[PDB]
RNA sequence: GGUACCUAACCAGAAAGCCACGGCUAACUACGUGCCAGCAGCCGCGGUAAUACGUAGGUGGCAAGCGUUGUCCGGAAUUAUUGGGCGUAAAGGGCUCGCAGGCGGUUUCUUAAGUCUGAUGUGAAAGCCCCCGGCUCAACCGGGGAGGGUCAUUGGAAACUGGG
RNA sequence: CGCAUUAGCUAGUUGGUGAGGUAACGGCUCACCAAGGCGACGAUGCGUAGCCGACCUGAGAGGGUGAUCGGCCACACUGGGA
């Protein structure tokens, strides 16, 4: 049964992105919405749209390919997993591909990028890396 | 009793001492309560440095300085500060 | 394995047993038991001295001794160098070093130590053969 | 393109290889060769021949046809990568100036001819030189330039 | 200045069969050193309860004391939640 | 120990002039004996060691000490090596060769801030004034016998280490990266 | 202990060995031996051209040391958390039902055990590292600092995990 | 720390009530009463070990050591008592 919904969203992207699909549709949650909002603000995806429903909702994500059909997302990794969580101190907040990629950290301050979190001097649950 | 005495550090023919507060039964270079300063009799002149606030704290608790420590305290003017405190 | 599976039953490192296991005992006379003490050489008494045939494709007469060590273990040793003075009842010093081509031979006798004499007319690698520096 | 750059070559190895035939064995010389400008272009070839000096010359020509461009920030690469090519598995971590090329065997040939001066590395997999160099070049092909990402992501390099 | 504090532990009762004596259990999460997963650890404690208030199942508070026997180093303070 | 052997065959093996003049490599610029990557790394280490004339154990530790400093490891490693007093004496021109400069120091002809230093491997620091002692002011070898990081005065026979070299001043024959490589094994 | 140190006088005079040299691995030739004597960590070498045996000349690496053995760690992303796997290479339980255990969809409120963060106390001295200073240098020694807790105590934040 | 090719272990044992004893709390001891207590989170047994600051190795995680120096413990022919 579904155990990691976040991993699933990351994997959905990864897979769509592998076959250069235009868009994909992920069952929503508050955190999935927040993740997707980050990806947009960092320019890993073109757009995100929220479709409401009787069930949980749907997030539509629109993948972003540069000219020469180059993928903007190279990779996405789930770090903290259900079967072994990972938390980072503020000084240990991970750099991803030496700054070209990003880390999404769930913090008390909120779900932030690595840059974001390091500025607010926060740590928290390291959800994913994206490069 | 609690003493104030010299702990031998340094190397074979070049002694250096730290002035430590120590119970009497403790081994010379072993267990001690607090470091109070440092005496380097080898240099010319003998380099002495003492942290009064502790030295006096421990004189007034009734740690007794060993003969040399006493004389080191004298030259920095501790023994005066100790004597004048018991009066005023 | 899953993390939970490691928490339950961890990783188990291998055992790396000694290349020279007769050096790695002692013997306590009073207790009559083996000690577990590694040593860099041992002493022992030659119970036999002979020659062995190497395993193929090598061919020679390889000079060996059958030594009973101070710790009461009995071991075959190789006798290196050209020509030696070991008979039965010689007191020898064995070191570590298997001879590859001699099945059973895990130790080398030390030349120049105890009753084992140095190699005669050796002039290069002398120290490895227990031989003093010829001139003066 | 290879006829405007001036390339140093390095022989990585030469195996004698052997095909069974009716009356015995046909021995040839398979020369594996890296070549580079020492300014961010590197690449490798093989040549097979009946005599060694020709096998090298064939391999060198091959390497000039299959160059790649290595992205380099300062004297190092932009960011960490793990270049895989079947069992070949090379870690490449960027390093501070004056570090030197801390790398092993074939991987060193590639990086030194590429013109990386400061890099950490480690062969985490196979050491068969062909697939070690393949892996290394996979790695160097997958390095992303910080300007190129910024144009992809629609951001500043700052 | 004020008194220094004894340790307090909120736990669950797992026996009442002894006279005036409950066996509380405290369940806490100790990290594994190597792996980093938190693991459920249980520590039983004998505590002294004078009026036999606490029964098997109850979520009790306890406080450390001087030794009250070979094993009892705690007294029952409160019964925070009763059994079902 | 020190190497007291022939100075030329070292130059000839390495394929550089260690004296800096060229003269070991005038007649026979090829290896000693009848036959005239690890190699090249080793060659480069032995280049720099044999030039300045230190034994490996002291050289490997002078490299470990230079690592702790801030900047390029190879660069800073050459800088200390240059600071050695035997070398500074030789650079100030008080001696014709490094082996003379050593012996000058070792036998106690040199002063550093007025005081006798009889240690070739003394690591000279900026500000410090190298001088000859008064017993040895009229040594033949000194009278017989300069970079910008140093300053000299041939009247007074006393120099000064005014700054640290900077690497462009030091021996450009040396690829110090190779030596940093040599040690990373 | 007339010991360190210092001054004066005399003499290159009294003071270099050890291992290696086929590859790994720096540095090669000759003679002797001829699967023998021997070498060897490994691949192996030795039956007439032996750079691998023994010697000699030289060369190389170190140096008052140099080799050898033993033991430990590394090389060994070779018990793999970092950091491996299981079609055919070693590796999917013969198959179920399941107790414990591990894991758990979506929203909102709340707690705050986890988690993040602050302050305080403590984690001796020496050591290691850093910055200085003393021995002619260094080793060594000293001073000031830093580090180091599944740490205690007491405040904050509340997304995530755990309660309710 | 190792061992399940060690799974049960305990009967002053676990708790209580008194008294005695101790510098002091306490099965510490004794009497009486109760039936408890511990253990698959590994009890119990067997084997091995003084522990630590540190030290060695390693990119680190980790592994190995616990000479010297400092802390703590234990022991003083062996077993027991004052």
From Swiss-Prot, chain A:
Protein name: Small ribosomal subunit protein uS8
Gene name for this UniProt entry: rpsH
A cellular component annotation (GO) from this entry: cytosolic small ribosomal subunit
Subunit and interaction comment: Part of the 30S ribosomal subunit. Contacts proteins S5 and S12.
Role played: One of the primary rRNA binding proteins, it binds directly to 16S rRNA central domain where it helps coordinate assembly of the platform of the 30S subunit.
NCBIfam families assigned to the protein according to its UniProt record, in alphabetical order: PRK00136.1
Record-level Gene Ontology MF annotations: rRNA binding; structural constituent of ribosome
Family annotation (InterPro entries): Ribosomal_uS8, Ribosomal_uS8_CS, Ribosomal_uS8_sf
Sorted UniProt keywords: Ribonucleoprotein, Ribosomal protein, RNA-binding, rRNA-binding
Family named by the database record: Belongs to the universal ribosomal protein uS8 family.
GO biological process: translation
Protein origin, superkingdom: Bacteria
Organism: Bacillus subtilis (strain 168)
From Swiss-Prot, chain B:
Family recorded in the similarity comment: Belongs to the bacterial ribosomal protein bS16 family.
Database matches in PROSITE patterns: RIBOSOMAL_S16
Protein name: Small ribosomal subunit protein bS16
Organism listed in the record: Bacillus subtilis (strain 168)
UniProtKB keywords: Ribonucleoprotein, Ribosomal protein
GO molecular function, one term: structural constituent of ribosome
GO cellular component terms given for this protein: cytoplasm; small ribosomal subunit
Biological-process GO terms, alphabetical: translation
A Pfam match: Ribosomal_S16
Gene name of this polypeptide: rpsP
Subunit structure: Part of the 30S ribosomal subunit.
UniProtKB/Swiss-Prot annotation, chain C:
Effect of residue 55 to D: Confers streptomycin resistance and very poor growth in rich medium
GO BP annotation list: response to antibiotic; translation
CDD domains found in the cross-reference section: Ribosomal_S12 (cd03368)
SUPFAM superfamilies reported for this sequence: Nucleic acid-binding proteins
Effect of residue 55 to I: In RPSL4; STRA1, confers streptomycin resistance and hyperaccurate translation, has no effect on natural antibiotic production
InterPro entries: NA-bd_OB-fold, Ribosomal_uS12, Ribosomal_uS12_bac
Region (Disordered): 32-54
Keywords associated with the record: Antibiotic resistance, Ribonucleoprotein, Ribosomal protein, RNA-binding, rRNA-binding, tRNA-binding
Entry GO terms, CC: ribosome; small ribosomal subunit
Site (Not modified): 101
A molecular function (GO) term: rRNA binding
Summary of subunit composition and partner proteins: Part of the 30S ribosomal subunit. Contacts proteins S8 and S17. May interact with IF1 in the 30S initiation complex. Interacts with BrxC.
Function: With S4 and S5 plays an important role in translational accuracy.
Note: Many streptomycin resistant B.subtilis with mutations in this protein produce increased quantities of a natural (but uncharacterized) antibiotic. A number of substitutions and deletions can promote streptomycin resistance, dependence or pseudodependence; all but one of these (K55R) are associated with hyperaccurate translation.
UniProt similarity note: Belongs to the universal ribosomal protein uS12 family.
NCBIfam families cross-referenced by the UniProt entry: rpsL_bact
PANTHER family (alphabetical): 30S RIBOSOMAL PROTEIN S12 FAMILY MEMBER
Protein name (record): Small ribosomal subunit protein uS12
Record organism: Bacillus subtilis (strain 168)
Gene behind this protein: rpsL
UniProtKB/Swiss-Prot annotation, chain D:
Effect upon mutating residue 108 to C: In rpsE8; suppresses S12 mutant K55D. RspE8 is lethal in the absence of the S12 mutation
InterPro entries: Ribosomal_Su5_D2-typ_SF (IPR020568), Ribosomal_uS5 (IPR000851), Ribosomal_uS5_bac-type (IPR005712), Ribosomal_uS5_C (IPR005324), Ribosomal_uS5_N (IPR013810), Ribosomal_uS5_N_CS (IPR018192), Ribsml_uS5_D2-typ_fold_subgr (IPR014721)
Gene Ontology terms for molecular function: rRNA binding; structural constituent of ribosome
UniProt keyword list: Antibiotic resistance, Ribonucleoprotein, Ribosomal protein, RNA-binding, rRNA-binding
Domain S5 DRBM: 7-70
Example of a GO biological process term: translation
One GO cellular component, as annotated: cytosolic small ribosomal subunit
This protein's domain notes: The N-terminal domain interacts with the head of the 30S subunit; the C-terminal domain interacts with the body and contacts protein S4. The interaction surface between S4 and S5 is involved in control of translational fidelity.
Family: Belongs to the universal ribosomal protein uS5 family.
Complex and partners: Part of the 30S ribosomal subunit. Contacts proteins S4 and S8.
Further information: Altered S5 proteins have been identified in a number of mutants. Some mutations in S5 have been shown to increase translational error frequencies.
Protein purpose: With S4 and S12 plays an important role in translational accuracy; many suppressors of streptomycin-dependent mutants of protein S12 are found in this protein, some but not all of which decrease translational accuracy (ram, ribosomal ambiguity mutations).
